[PDB]
Amino acid sequence: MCLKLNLLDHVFANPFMNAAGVLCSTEEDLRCMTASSSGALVSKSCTSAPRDGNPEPRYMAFPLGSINSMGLPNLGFDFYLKYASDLHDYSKKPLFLSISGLSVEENVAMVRRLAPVAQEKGVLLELNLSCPNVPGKPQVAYDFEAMRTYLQQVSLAYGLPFGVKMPPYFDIAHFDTAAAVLNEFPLVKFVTCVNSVGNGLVIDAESESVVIKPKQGFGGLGGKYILPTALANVNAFYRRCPDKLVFGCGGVYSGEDAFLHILAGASMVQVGTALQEEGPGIFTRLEDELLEIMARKGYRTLEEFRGRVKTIE
Amino acid sequence: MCLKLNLLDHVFANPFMNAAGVLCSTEEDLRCMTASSSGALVSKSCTSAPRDGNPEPRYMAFPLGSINSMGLPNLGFDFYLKYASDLHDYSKKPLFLSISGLSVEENVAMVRRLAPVAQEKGVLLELNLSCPNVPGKPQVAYDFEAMRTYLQQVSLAYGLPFGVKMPPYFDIAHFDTAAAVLNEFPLVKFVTCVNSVGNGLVIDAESESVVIKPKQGFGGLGGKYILPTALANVNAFYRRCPDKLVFGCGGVYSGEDAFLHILAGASMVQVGTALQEEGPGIFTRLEDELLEIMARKGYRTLEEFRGRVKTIE
Ligand SMILES: Cc1cc2nc3c(=O)[nH]c(=O)nc-3n(C[C@H](O)[C@H](O)[C@H](O)COP(=O)(O)O)c2cc1C
Ligand SMILES: Cc1cc2nc3c(=O)[nH]c(=O)nc-3n(C[C@H](O)[C@H](O)[C@H](O)COP(=O)(O)O)c2cc1C
Ligand SMILES: O=C(O)c1[nH]c(=O)[nH]c(=O)c1CCc1ccccc1C(F)(F)F
Ligand SMILES: O=C(O)c1[nH]c(=O)[nH]c(=O)c1CCc1ccccc1C(F)(F)F
């Protein structure tokens, strides 16, 4: 019994990888992720130009999860592109490169340059749709008309299979609408569910203060707080997008959590907050735990239970 | 040192009450909440006609919280109106009556008949804007033009101060819009943040099954899952609605959680999942734990720290 799988025409030793933004910003981080037992890795979402990001403290963690308003600190697209092109060892595992431009034009300019490296090396694009929008408007993935424009422009500019990172939704009509938009794009072959649960607020009772500095303490939530939300989105998309893959992300701390995501429909399982907290050693433990649950259940393959969550009557 | 508050022309011994839907369906429930040490009570959100609600299991609870898709089982408006006009003992504590009609007109007919009882007995209206829209559209409070319509018509029809129960939002543009809408209506004197976090999905690893029956296992989340989300919404609306009160609801299990809510801006503090799980004895413990925190910090009243959460710079 081993967890290897094949998707998007790549081979993966197991279904685990980091979540975009965790342990993937610098060359040192990417080498450390490559050296881990993860099945794959994804680089920090990038902009055309480097960014310092928001003032610190900008990330904090707690027993039940984490909050962040990092502000997209990153080395810039030229760095991640050079990483994909010249530095990454594709014999070790596949690489996803995440992009999140400030505008549709910025996104188009980066994907045009990425396309030739994706052909030459097999680096895979994850487009981060939790990106800023026009004035007055929510993030792009919560504005379905902007999301349709961005995906049209990117599909045309890029021309190759890619995936999208989605924020969580909380209403069934939204699931219906969001999946219908994504289903208009045959190049979108995977959907990752979910990004951080937006704009929560952690307050420390002793100091009577918020715990991160930007945005008056508001920031995205990850970890145990968000698992049932993450499983919902995974399963909603799995059901509505039968010709695409779904990657789960949200609240993975154990092989059991991972098991649940795969039952919900996940092909790959991303780890954010728990990886931030525990370090890359976590991938050996998650593999071991997930194999142990499978043995106890008599499952030999992931395919045997992926997406087979049971409903009641 | 005291928990007393005076608001909306009523006097409350302390800020605690049940969350709508918990321990408030039946005359027996309402008499039990009345008997409790809560500073107030609210009745189950009602429709004109009684409802059986969804098939069971439709609520489950776990260490970090709860999921429900109850389908608004309730005894009908005539019953809650009779409880408010003839049965409730107002010398014990104040009463909120929650309504959630399936259309603007069903809300209008109910508030027209509540008005004289509100004037004569002092019952306070909480309008639950998480009611379904036309199916296939999101819930009313996630459709800002529908929410506006409902509030115009209910304001005209009722003509007395009332409050609104809001779902959580996750995007600053949403906070901005939702508050602007509410700020159009001077009779909306209190905003309760938040209802359950919509359409999560709990999966049981052993059985490989969702844990509630309706909606293929999708339901609203409460409890520890949702505290930072609830704090964010309380503070967002506190900061955007300076002429309105904010009541806090979500994730309260302790006097410390109540303290955080209050710091965020909460006036009243509602207790759902933890009350469902622990029973009405929770109110004495909450009061004792909140008083202990206040004593240790030197606070004598709630207004000394309400809304005084600190930001960093
Ligand atoms: C410090 C930090 C930085 C992140 N940066 C990104 C990013 O650059 N792009 C992105 O798509 N998601 C980003 N995320 C979101 C995660 O990729 C993931 O969607 C989220 O944390 C929920 O997964 P978790 O519960 O395992 O944390 C970030 C998360 C954290 C905690
Ligand atoms: C079984 C159940 C029934 C509920 N019914 C109602 C309802 O009728 N009206 C309403 O406004 N909120 C309803 N809610 C939401 C709660 O009032 C509350 O907003 C939510 O559970 C979050 O608080 P908590 O974290 O303390 O549970 C219900 C919650 C539960 C768990
Ligand atoms: O860098 C982040 O703060 C971040 N944190 C998350 O939990 N998820 C994310 O997707 C991101 C980056 C979001 C983003 C994307 C594009 C431009 C700007 C930003 C922002 F960080 F500034 F918000
Ligand atoms: O009764 C519920 O299912 C319920 N659960 C919550 O956590 N919050 C709620 O507001 C509700 C009631 C929502 C509602 C409102 C009006 C008509 C119908 C309903 C619905 F339950 F059928 F969705």
PDB file of N, CA, C and O in Angstrom, chain B residues 102-151:
ATOM      1  N   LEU B 102     -41.698  34.165   4.752  1.00  0.00           N
ATOM      2  CA  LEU B 102     -41.228  33.668   3.497  1.00  0.00           C
ATOM      3  C   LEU B 102     -41.403  34.632   2.336  1.00  0.00           C
ATOM      4  O   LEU B 102     -41.069  34.328   1.241  1.00  0.00           O
ATOM      5  N   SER B 103     -41.989  35.770   2.625  1.00  0.00           N
ATOM      6  CA  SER B 103     -42.138  36.830   1.687  1.00  0.00           C
ATOM      7  C   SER B 103     -42.236  38.164   2.381  1.00  0.00           C
ATOM      8  O   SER B 103     -42.486  38.226   3.549  1.00  0.00           O
ATOM      9  N   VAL B 104     -42.084  39.223   1.616  1.00  0.00           N
ATOM     10  CA  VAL B 104     -42.227  40.516   2.192  1.00  0.00           C
ATOM     11  C   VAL B 104     -43.651  40.664   2.740  1.00  0.00           C
ATOM     12  O   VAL B 104     -43.808  41.134   3.810  1.00  0.00           O
ATOM     13  N   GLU B 105     -44.680  40.153   2.045  1.00  0.00           N
ATOM     14  CA  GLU B 105     -46.017  40.394   2.486  1.00  0.00           C
ATOM     15  C   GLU B 105     -46.292  39.617   3.805  1.00  0.00           C
ATOM     16  O   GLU B 105     -47.016  40.109   4.634  1.00  0.00           O
ATOM     17  N   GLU B 106     -45.791  38.389   3.941  1.00  0.00           N
ATOM     18  CA  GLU B 106     -46.015  37.587   5.174  1.00  0.00           C
ATOM     19  C   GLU B 106     -45.327  38.341   6.319  1.00  0.00           C
ATOM     20  O   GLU B 106     -45.938  38.476   7.351  1.00  0.00           O
ATOM     21  N   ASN B 107     -44.128  38.902   6.116  1.00  0.00           N
ATOM     22  CA  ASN B 107     -43.523  39.781   7.177  1.00  0.00           C
ATOM     23  C   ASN B 107     -44.349  41.016   7.522  1.00  0.00           C
ATOM     24  O   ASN B 107     -44.551  41.315   8.706  1.00  0.00           O
ATOM     25  N   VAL B 108     -44.871  41.710   6.488  1.00  0.00           N
ATOM     26  CA  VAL B 108     -45.701  42.842   6.701  1.00  0.00           C
ATOM     27  C   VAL B 108     -46.966  42.474   7.486  1.00  0.00           C
ATOM     28  O   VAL B 108     -47.326  43.173   8.437  1.00  0.00           O
ATOM     29  N   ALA B 109     -47.659  41.380   7.149  1.00  0.00           N
ATOM     30  CA  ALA B 109     -48.863  41.046   7.881  1.00  0.00           C
ATOM     31  C   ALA B 109     -48.578  40.719   9.340  1.00  0.00           C
ATOM     32  O   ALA B 109     -49.314  41.140  10.245  1.00  0.00           O
ATOM     33  N   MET B 110     -47.473  40.045   9.589  1.00  0.00           N
ATOM     34  CA  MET B 110     -47.116  39.731  10.983  1.00  0.00           C
ATOM     35  C   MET B 110     -46.762  41.005  11.762  1.00  0.00           C
ATOM     36  O   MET B 110     -47.304  41.228  12.842  1.00  0.00           O
ATOM     37  N   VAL B 111     -45.908  41.875  11.230  1.00  0.00           N
ATOM     38  CA  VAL B 111     -45.539  43.073  11.999  1.00  0.00           C
ATOM     39  C   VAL B 111     -46.740  44.031  12.217  1.00  0.00           C
ATOM     40  O   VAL B 111     -46.829  44.685  13.240  1.00  0.00           O
ATOM     41  N   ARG B 112     -47.673  44.084  11.283  1.00  0.00           N
ATOM     42  CA  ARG B 112     -48.878  44.888  11.499  1.00  0.00           C
ATOM     43  C   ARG B 112     -49.654  44.462  12.696  1.00  0.00           C
ATOM     44  O   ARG B 112     -50.184  45.305  13.431  1.00  0.00           O
ATOM     45  N   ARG B 113     -49.759  43.156  12.904  1.00  0.00           N
ATOM     46  CA  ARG B 113     -50.436  42.616  14.077  1.00  0.00           C
ATOM     47  C   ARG B 113     -49.606  42.620  15.369  1.00  0.00           C
ATOM     48  O   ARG B 113     -50.173  42.604  16.452  1.00  0.00           O
ATOM     49  N   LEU B 114     -48.296  42.574  15.255  1.00  0.00           N
ATOM     50  CA  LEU B 114     -47.406  42.686  16.444  1.00  0.00           C
ATOM     51  C   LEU B 114     -47.421  44.097  17.006  1.00  0.00           C
ATOM     52  O   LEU B 114     -47.331  44.270  18.217  1.00  0.00           O
ATOM     53  N   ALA B 115     -47.582  45.103  16.155  1.00  0.00           N
ATOM     54  CA  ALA B 115     -47.404  46.474  16.575  1.00  0.00           C
ATOM     55  C   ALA B 115     -48.166  46.875  17.827  1.00  0.00           C
ATOM     56  O   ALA B 115     -47.568  47.407  18.790  1.00  0.00           O
ATOM     57  N   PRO B 116     -49.465  46.618  17.891  1.00  0.00           N
ATOM     58  CA  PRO B 116     -50.205  47.018  19.098  1.00  0.00           C
ATOM     59  C   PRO B 116     -49.746  46.306  20.391  1.00  0.00           C
ATOM     60  O   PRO B 116     -49.775  46.892  21.474  1.00  0.00           O
ATOM     61  N   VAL B 117     -49.325  45.073  20.273  1.00  0.00           N
ATOM     62  CA  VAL B 117     -48.786  44.322  21.420  1.00  0.00           C
ATOM     63  C   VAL B 117     -47.414  44.875  21.794  1.00  0.00           C
ATOM     64  O   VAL B 117     -47.125  44.986  22.972  1.00  0.00           O
ATOM     65  N   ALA B 118     -46.611  45.282  20.824  1.00  0.00           N
ATOM     66  CA  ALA B 118     -45.341  45.946  21.099  1.00  0.00           C
ATOM     67  C   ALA B 118     -45.552  47.244  21.871  1.00  0.00           C
ATOM     68  O   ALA B 118     -44.894  47.470  22.876  1.00  0.00           O
ATOM     69  N   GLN B 119     -46.548  48.028  21.470  1.00  0.00           N
ATOM     70  CA  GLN B 119     -46.886  49.313  22.114  1.00  0.00           C
ATOM     71  C   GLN B 119     -47.429  49.133  23.503  1.00  0.00           C
ATOM     72  O   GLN B 119     -47.036  49.835  24.413  1.00  0.00           O
ATOM     73  N   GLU B 120     -48.303  48.179  23.679  1.00  0.00           N
ATOM     74  CA  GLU B 120     -48.920  47.980  24.964  1.00  0.00           C
ATOM     75  C   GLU B 120     -48.112  47.123  25.973  1.00  0.00           C
ATOM     76  O   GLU B 120     -48.165  47.384  27.180  1.00  0.00           O
ATOM     77  N   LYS B 121     -47.397  46.114  25.518  1.00  0.00           N
ATOM     78  CA  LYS B 121     -46.618  45.222  26.458  1.00  0.00           C
ATOM     79  C   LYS B 121     -45.113  45.415  26.380  1.00  0.00           C
ATOM     80  O   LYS B 121     -44.403  45.029  27.303  1.00  0.00           O
ATOM     81  N   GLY B 122     -44.615  46.009  25.298  1.00  0.00           N
ATOM     82  CA  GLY B 122     -43.157  46.261  25.265  1.00  0.00           C
ATOM     83  C   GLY B 122     -42.348  45.130  24.625  1.00  0.00           C
ATOM     84  O   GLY B 122     -41.115  45.184  24.621  1.00  0.00           O
ATOM     85  N   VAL B 123     -43.019  44.116  24.043  1.00  0.00           N
ATOM     86  CA  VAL B 123     -42.294  43.111  23.287  1.00  0.00           C
ATOM     87  C   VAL B 123     -41.495  43.781  22.151  1.00  0.00           C
ATOM     88  O   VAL B 123     -41.968  44.733  21.532  1.00  0.00           O
ATOM     89  N   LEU B 124     -40.262  43.324  21.915  1.00  0.00           N
ATOM     90  CA  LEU B 124     -39.349  43.907  20.941  1.00  0.00           C
ATOM     91  C   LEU B 124     -39.223  42.945  19.753  1.00  0.00           C
ATOM     92  O   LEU B 124     -38.988  41.743  19.928  1.00  0.00           O
ATOM     93  N   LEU B 125     -39.319  43.479  18.550  1.00  0.00           N
ATOM     94  CA  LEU B 125     -39.183  42.746  17.298  1.00  0.00           C
ATOM     95  C   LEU B 125     -37.701  42.625  16.787  1.00  0.00           C
ATOM     96  O   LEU B 125     -36.966  43.608  16.772  1.00  0.00           O
ATOM     97  N   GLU B 126     -37.300  41.389  16.486  1.00  0.00           N
ATOM     98  CA  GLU B 126     -36.054  40.981  15.810  1.00  0.00           C
ATOM     99  C   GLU B 126     -36.492  40.336  14.507  1.00  0.00           C
ATOM    100  O   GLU B 126     -37.237  39.321  14.441  1.00  0.00           O
ATOM    101  N   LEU B 127     -36.146  40.996  13.423  1.00  0.00           N
ATOM    102  CA  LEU B 127     -36.501  40.493  12.123  1.00  0.00           C
ATOM    103  C   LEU B 127     -35.321  39.703  11.572  1.00  0.00           C
ATOM    104  O   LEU B 127     -34.245  40.250  11.392  1.00  0.00           O
ATOM    105  N   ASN B 128     -35.540  38.419  11.266  1.00  0.00           N
ATOM    106  CA  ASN B 128     -34.509  37.549  10.869  1.00  0.00           C
ATOM    107  C   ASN B 128     -34.407  37.613   9.374  1.00  0.00           C
ATOM    108  O   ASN B 128     -35.268  37.026   8.658  1.00  0.00           O
ATOM    109  N   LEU B 129     -33.335  38.311   8.897  1.00  0.00           N
ATOM    110  CA  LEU B 129     -33.204  38.481   7.454  1.00  0.00           C
ATOM    111  C   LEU B 129     -32.473  37.323   6.735  1.00  0.00           C
ATOM    112  O   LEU B 129     -32.204  37.427   5.538  1.00  0.00           O
ATOM    113  N   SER B 130     -32.249  36.223   7.407  1.00  0.00           N
ATOM    114  CA  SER B 130     -31.744  35.048   6.756  1.00  0.00           C
ATOM    115  C   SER B 130     -32.860  34.205   6.151  1.00  0.00           C
ATOM    116  O   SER B 130     -32.643  33.146   5.786  1.00  0.00           O
ATOM    117  N   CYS B 131     -34.070  34.726   6.077  1.00  0.00           N
ATOM    118  CA  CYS B 131     -35.157  34.029   5.417  1.00  0.00           C
ATOM    119  C   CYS B 131     -34.844  33.831   3.908  1.00  0.00           C
ATOM    120  O   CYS B 131     -34.183  34.599   3.268  1.00  0.00           O
ATOM    121  N   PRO B 132     -35.392  32.652   3.410  1.00  0.00           N
ATOM    122  CA  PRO B 132     -35.219  32.468   1.980  1.00  0.00           C
ATOM    123  C   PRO B 132     -36.008  33.492   1.181  1.00  0.00           C
ATOM    124  O   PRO B 132     -37.057  33.888   1.526  1.00  0.00           O
ATOM    125  N   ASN B 133     -35.409  33.799   0.072  1.00  0.00           N
ATOM    126  CA  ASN B 133     -35.765  34.682  -0.997  1.00  0.00           C
ATOM    127  C   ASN B 133     -36.690  33.864  -1.893  1.00  0.00           C
ATOM    128  O   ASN B 133     -37.385  32.976  -1.442  1.00  0.00           O
ATOM    129  N   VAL B 134     -36.770  34.219  -3.141  1.00  0.00           N
ATOM    130  CA  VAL B 134     -37.202  33.281  -4.122  1.00  0.00           C
ATOM    131  C   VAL B 134     -36.155  32.176  -4.186  1.00  0.00           C
ATOM    132  O   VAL B 134     -35.014  32.478  -4.177  1.00  0.00           O
ATOM    133  N   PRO B 135     -36.622  30.842  -4.223  1.00  0.00           N
ATOM    134  CA  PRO B 135     -35.543  29.843  -4.229  1.00  0.00           C
ATOM    135  C   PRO B 135     -34.694  29.951  -5.513  1.00  0.00           C
ATOM    136  O   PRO B 135     -35.149  30.331  -6.547  1.00  0.00           O
ATOM    137  N   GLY B 136     -33.425  29.681  -5.377  1.00  0.00           N
ATOM    138  CA  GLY B 136     -32.454  30.003  -6.370  1.00  0.00           C
ATOM    139  C   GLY B 136     -31.811  31.358  -6.238  1.00  0.00           C
ATOM    140  O   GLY B 136     -30.924  31.667  -6.969  1.00  0.00           O
ATOM    141  N   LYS B 137     -32.261  32.154  -5.299  1.00  0.00           N
ATOM    142  CA  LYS B 137     -31.599  33.373  -4.988  1.00  0.00           C
ATOM    143  C   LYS B 137     -31.039  33.241  -3.600  1.00  0.00           C
ATOM    144  O   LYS B 137     -31.459  32.427  -2.858  1.00  0.00           O
ATOM    145  N   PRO B 138     -30.061  34.042  -3.290  1.00  0.00           N
ATOM    146  CA  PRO B 138     -29.480  33.796  -1.937  1.00  0.00           C
ATOM    147  C   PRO B 138     -30.484  34.250  -0.885  1.00  0.00           C
ATOM    148  O   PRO B 138     -31.507  34.942  -1.211  1.00  0.00           O
ATOM    149  N   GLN B 139     -30.138  34.002   0.367  1.00  0.00           N
ATOM    150  CA  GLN B 139     -30.941  34.486   1.467  1.00  0.00           C
ATOM    151  C   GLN B 139     -31.098  36.009   1.374  1.00  0.00           C
ATOM    152  O   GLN B 139     -30.245  36.702   0.797  1.00  0.00           O
ATOM    153  N   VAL B 140     -32.193  36.539   1.935  1.00  0.00           N
ATOM    154  CA  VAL B 140     -32.505  37.959   1.769  1.00  0.00           C
ATOM    155  C   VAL B 140     -31.308  38.906   2.108  1.00  0.00           C
ATOM    156  O   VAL B 140     -31.014  39.871   1.395  1.00  0.00           O
ATOM    157  N   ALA B 141     -30.597  38.624   3.176  1.00  0.00           N
ATOM    158  CA  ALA B 141     -29.549  39.535   3.619  1.00  0.00           C
ATOM    159  C   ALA B 141     -28.309  39.421   2.761  1.00  0.00           C
ATOM    160  O   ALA B 141     -27.427  40.235   2.880  1.00  0.00           O
ATOM    161  N   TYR B 142     -28.215  38.436   1.885  1.00  0.00           N
ATOM    162  CA  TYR B 142     -27.177  38.422   0.922  1.00  0.00           C
ATOM    163  C   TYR B 142     -27.652  38.942  -0.443  1.00  0.00           C
ATOM    164  O   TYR B 142     -26.915  38.820  -1.411  1.00  0.00           O
ATOM    165  N   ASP B 143     -28.842  39.520  -0.484  1.00  0.00           N
ATOM    166  CA  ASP B 143     -29.346  40.232  -1.669  1.00  0.00           C
ATOM    167  C   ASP B 143     -29.778  41.617  -1.187  1.00  0.00           C
ATOM    168  O   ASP B 143     -30.940  41.818  -0.702  1.00  0.00           O
ATOM    169  N   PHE B 144     -28.881  42.580  -1.372  1.00  0.00           N
ATOM    170  CA  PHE B 144     -29.029  43.915  -0.767  1.00  0.00           C
ATOM    171  C   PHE B 144     -30.217  44.671  -1.280  1.00  0.00           C
ATOM    172  O   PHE B 144     -30.830  45.408  -0.484  1.00  0.00           O
ATOM    173  N   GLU B 145     -30.617  44.447  -2.539  1.00  0.00           N
ATOM    174  CA  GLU B 145     -31.835  45.120  -2.998  1.00  0.00           C
ATOM    175  C   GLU B 145     -33.101  44.470  -2.353  1.00  0.00           C
ATOM    176  O   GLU B 145     -34.070  45.211  -1.976  1.00  0.00           O
ATOM    177  N   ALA B 146     -33.090  43.140  -2.170  1.00  0.00           N
ATOM    178  CA  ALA B 146     -34.227  42.513  -1.464  1.00  0.00           C
ATOM    179  C   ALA B 146     -34.245  42.955  -0.025  1.00  0.00           C
ATOM    180  O   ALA B 146     -35.329  43.216   0.577  1.00  0.00           O
ATOM    181  N   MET B 147     -33.052  43.049   0.587  1.00  0.00           N
ATOM    182  CA  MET B 147     -33.006  43.457   1.998  1.00  0.00           C
ATOM    183  C   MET B 147     -33.562  44.865   2.172  1.00  0.00           C
ATOM    184  O   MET B 147     -34.283  45.148   3.102  1.00  0.00           O
ATOM    185  N   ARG B 148     -33.240  45.741   1.240  1.00  0.00           N
ATOM    186  CA  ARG B 148     -33.801  47.075   1.257  1.00  0.00           C
ATOM    187  C   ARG B 148     -35.310  47.109   1.177  1.00  0.00           C
ATOM    188  O   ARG B 148     -35.982  47.829   1.949  1.00  0.00           O
ATOM    189  N   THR B 149     -35.857  46.339   0.250  1.00  0.00           N
ATOM    190  CA  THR B 149     -37.308  46.200   0.125  1.00  0.00           C
ATOM    191  C   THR B 149     -37.980  45.737   1.392  1.00  0.00           C
ATOM    192  O   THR B 149     -38.979  46.343   1.905  1.00  0.00           O
ATOM    193  N   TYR B 150     -37.407  44.681   1.969  1.00  0.00           N
ATOM    194  CA  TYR B 150     -38.002  44.144   3.205  1.00  0.00           C
ATOM    195  C   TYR B 150     -37.998  45.179   4.302  1.00  0.00           C
ATOM    196  O   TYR B 150     -38.978  45.314   5.036  1.00  0.00           O
ATOM    197  N   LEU B 151     -36.908  45.905   4.439  1.00  0.00           N
ATOM    198  CA  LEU B 151     -36.802  46.889   5.517  1.00  0.00           C
ATOM    199  C   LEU B 151     -37.698  48.097   5.271  1.00  0.00           C
ATOM    200  O   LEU B 151     -38.266  48.633   6.245  1.00  0.00           O
TER     201      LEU B 151
END
